[PDB]
């Protein structure tokens, strides 16, 4: 293998230069199953990784296992392959007494109260996602009719409230700000949606929308 | 007037909703020219506001003067006064060698290197800029044709020390500044500006859109010195796309 | 199940109050096996875990995943099965040249270079390890006639930058953590790791005792490579040492 | 210009090496007013400077404009041009039962609740003025007859309390944290007076105070 | 002398490798009485040595004074004179219920609530114990029969708190968290050790077993 | 008594309410004896102290022992025993150039590298002296014809890392403390010292008022080595500059 964690070697990506990273498995299957041509690469600790290809490219999956460390690895060792695009996708609780189950959250930016966006800027750097990627994820939950809220999610290393309600903070999650973050600084692009669940209908759509999220993004 | 600043009644708005906010009131009258029966509001320090129609809708153009301290009294007014939306016109220098004189930036987010900033929303939380904004004014840029460039934006507390500038008096940069400008470069990040945090963070926080967008009217990173129009041509462009960006968030 | 993550019932543990709890789901059932009657009792993600039997008492055996986010998952719902014992167990690269392939680490405490343990006690509260875990651990180790080094690990977020690595995609390393490998050097730190600070600081504060114990497969400033056997035999003497040090904790 | 925002050279100081910065151009007039030979140099944005005389040595009064990032750049590009020593002059309220309306507050250091200051140097060292300043101040109030106090003044970025008030604080404000602390890190003397409003007859003693100070420095 | 303020030179210590350091004086002079030869050496400000012998080894006695600050001039000057084993002896309260007056208290490691340890390591790394150390103190400790208790000490620098208890702490004092970080961040062997007077009898338990542990450590 | 660590009642002063306080117990007689009717009142541990009289006002002279933690029992016990004026009287070294050995330090405000301070007051607090006490301490000194320097002083918690000395058992200066004498230089600081932070902090955030004069006995920054009577000359000057400010702070 090339990479010291995820059993890959920069052929297995077959030109790959966009990866989408959800949290788990299972999550990894269903969304390479919505493209074409998927194939199951490896499999190492949490990270699971498939190859699939959308309008003749291909494109990598690969799961991050749980919070900023994990997910750490994950994106850095892709990088290392030839991955320049993260899509995260994800389910999540809404704090937003205006948001409703069902209803699609694209992530501008995240209050970084975790620990290893740290090791990549410090504080006062904004964990922010890339332009390009937030259009495509908004363009893409509009085009198959999705209730859409776009702004800033909280996200932390363990599984302020109220403040975070007050100052209109959307959801709350544990990867984004490393994800964000550790893209933002190093030049790589990054977005993040994620399906309201509470406040597999909206992940099958969040599912959806980052693939064809993806698809912009080629 | 009903605000303890600007020296502007709610009446004096017309029922505005969006504020153009440059830092110069100098150049608040050349941005209201740009629109529909513009005229001067007041004029009290650097707070110079005149109030224009676009499409139908009034608009205010309101200068914001230099710091995040200055900004913050500027863009709290307003909002009582009712400004909802606020885009932020500027003209900068860049830090990376790839971006030219005449470029234009939009502002997704700013490395809050203020302290203004800190008194709306924790350090944790983002200086982001809102999304239909930061898309207006990027379709604005194209629009007009315009070489634009989409990032982060360090805004700092200071103009030397704070920006890693050497040719000042004491030729000294305190230790958590010593190195940054080559930190924030390898970054990705596009420049420097002095109120960005302190306008994006507070909006951010309370409910308000804003947005950013500037001229490069200078590089520090090129040796190449810019043209005698230094600014002229490349702030009238800013200062059209800013315009046209509104009209998109009326 | 009682918990909403390892999908385990507390009935599942057989009253167990000790746990060996590795990183990786694949060395559980390799732990397990050194033991009496082992059985698969569940495997969400990275959560596989296995019970079996120690001198008559039943000892669980669960993988934490990677990470402190992880890692706290897992110790708070061992704990609120009935676990009140920890003892990781792992292999690491150290970062001491005096340190060689083949021995072993037993670690008395860690630098906090991580997240989550600042949920469970301010950063001013120890990541410490139990004594009576250690002196175990040390113990087990000695027996084994086993070349051991009790001391400070350091307990990064991050596989990279936290670890100062620099053969990455960027290659770059933020402040902070710019020189940080010479300095942990210099202060006698064994090795990097990613979990221990979450498990030490939240044992250490709950009432709980934990202890940590690591064979040396690698080490970095060493230019030989690790013999063929990179892990094989070191981790066969680790999981022994972590099993007989969890015989004198029952 | 010789500097990028004042819109000046050396030659407009005329040998000047001490400068009185309030923050407003009106202030700005009426101290120049006091000394002889009064003439206005510049207006940039919130930089307008006059240069005056006291005893046939050339002075300089410029307004800061709000807050600590404006006031370091008038205060950097003045030192640019020569300046050595400076006097800040104010009006604020006070916060201590025993402070009345009328009386004159030399700040002998202030609490950093700033963000620019932390450009200059780390939060342990103090916002200190100097020694000959506060002592010129102090005598030129007394001069005059002024009820006067001299302390700690609380400097922030806003336009903790009670905390300050039980800790002797005199006051606050908003730009005397990044002035002294700028000059008494980089060799640079400077004082702070100010007249209390609340808790133009005060300011106008204040003004003249600080004026008054200004010839026992040069 | 070889030191600035012990008034030591390496010659005094004959060889000695391991030290005692208490706070005071008096409780010097008792340490030095249980063991072989005992000599005072010098006695500089809060600086009192004396020098004696274990099977004989020879063994330093010296007082620290109060605080981190005076502890880190001690334990310095001590080390470049030779020394690289550190115990010290403390009587202290406690703050857990089970703990009872005359029970002994052995630290595994500290809460770093002081100034000084900060001039050796960042608040990450743990101000933590020697193991040889730890576990010579326990045996002395079991060895006379004396009830141990084994885990953390809060130590600031002041002469928070349910949270300590809360979190497991079982004492406060001063000095441990200056000794223990600047000893394990420099290859320095230390070790705790403090008899519970309060939450001179335990006092001459905890001395006699710091002895005994000093033995055990030659 | 009627305080836990002087061993002093009230009585004891004499109604005194001006304290002269030096580090080391053995320069106090030497002090009071300057003045009338000299007494040892006490001795406790480095707590040592006397009475006297100046112009028939009764004022003490107390050490405060080496660091802020002893320094803040000496200073909260006496204030407590109705002190309300401390002058602290050392000799120190100083770290510019042309600050010469023999010269006087009077110091404005403190550097705050200790940890003690933190008690009484927050980081933005700063450890300011008061005017009156700095007044007559710069007076006193003119009077004597000493030459004074007056400005701040870096008060650190330790005499080695944090005053960046490297002539040490391990030669290793924390990453916080590496360069940071260049930088103290650079900003004008006159020397290290290691009770000021604490002393100036507490007296400032108490309504209580506090002075600092100190003679220059050594210079790290010259190669010529301090001439015999590297102390005495110059502590002597320095005892009888703060007598003579008390005198008029009575």
Same mark, same amino acid.
Request: hydrophobic letters at 45%.
């Given at each position: 293998?090339?990479?010291?964690?995820?059993?890959?070697? &920069?052929?297995?990506?077959?030109?790959?230069?966009? $990866?989408?990273?959800?949290?788990?498995?299972?999550?990894?299957?269903? /969304?390479?199953?919505?493209?074409? &041509?998927?194939?199951?690469?490896?499999?190492?600790?949490?990270?699971?990784?498939?190859? $699939?290809?959308?309008?003749? &490219?291909?494109?990598?999956?690969?799961? +991050?296992?749980?919070? %900023?460390?994990?997910?750490?690895?994950?994106?850095?060792?892709?990088?290392?392959?030839?991955?320049?695009? *993260?899509?995260?996708?994800?389910?999540? %609780?809404? /704090?937003?007494?205006? /948001?409703?189950?069902?209803?699609?959250?694209?992530? +501008?930016?995240?209050?970084?109260?975790?620990? $290893?966006?740290?090791? *990549?800027?410090?504080?006062?750097?904004? $964990?922010? =996602?890339? *332009?390009?990627?937030?259009?495509?994820?908004?363009?893409?939950?509009?085009?198959?009719?999705?209730?859409?809220?776009?702004?800033?999610?909280?996200?932390?290393?363990? *599984?302020?409230?109220?403040?975070?309600? =007050?100052?209109?903070?959307?959801?709350?999650?544990?990867?984004? =700000?490393?994800? #964000?973050?550790?893209?933002?600084?190093? !030049?790589?692009?990054? %977005?993040?949606?994620? !399906?309201? /669940?509470?406040? &597999?209908?909206?992940?099958?759509? =969040?599912?959806?929308?980052?693939?064809?999220?993806?698809?912009?993004? #080629?």
């Amino acid at each position: 293998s090339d990479v010291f964690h995820l059993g890959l070697t &920069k052929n297995d990506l077959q030109g790959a230069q966009l $990866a989408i990273v959800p949290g788990d498995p299972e999550r990894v299957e269903k /969304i390479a199953a919505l493209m074409d &041509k998927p194939v199951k690469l490896a499999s190492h600790r949490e990270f699971t990784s498939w190859r $699939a290809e959308l309008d003749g &490219k291909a494109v990598i999956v690969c799961s +991050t296992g749980i919070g %900023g460390p994990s997910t750490s690895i994950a994106v850095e060792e892709l990088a290392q392959l030839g991955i320049r695009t *993260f899509l995260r996708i994800g389910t999540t %609780g809404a /704090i937003q007494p205006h /948001i409703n189950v069902g209803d699609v959250l694209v992530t +501008t930016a995240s209050v970084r109260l975790d620990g $290893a966006s740290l090791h *990549f800027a410090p504080m006062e750097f904004p $964990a922010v =996602a890339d *332009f390009a990627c937030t259009t495509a994820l908004v363009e893409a939950a509009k085009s198959i009719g999705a209730t859409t809220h776009v702004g800033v999610t909280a996200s932390s290393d363990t *599984f302020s409230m109220e403040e975070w309600q =007050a100052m209109g903070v959307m959801n709350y999650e544990m990867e984004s =700000a490393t994800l #964000l973050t550790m893209c933002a600084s190093q !030049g790589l692009r990054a %977005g993040m949606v994620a !399906g309201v /669940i509470v406040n &597999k209908q909206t992940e099958s759509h =969040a599912v959806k929308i980052v693939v064809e999220a993806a698809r912009r993004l #080629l």
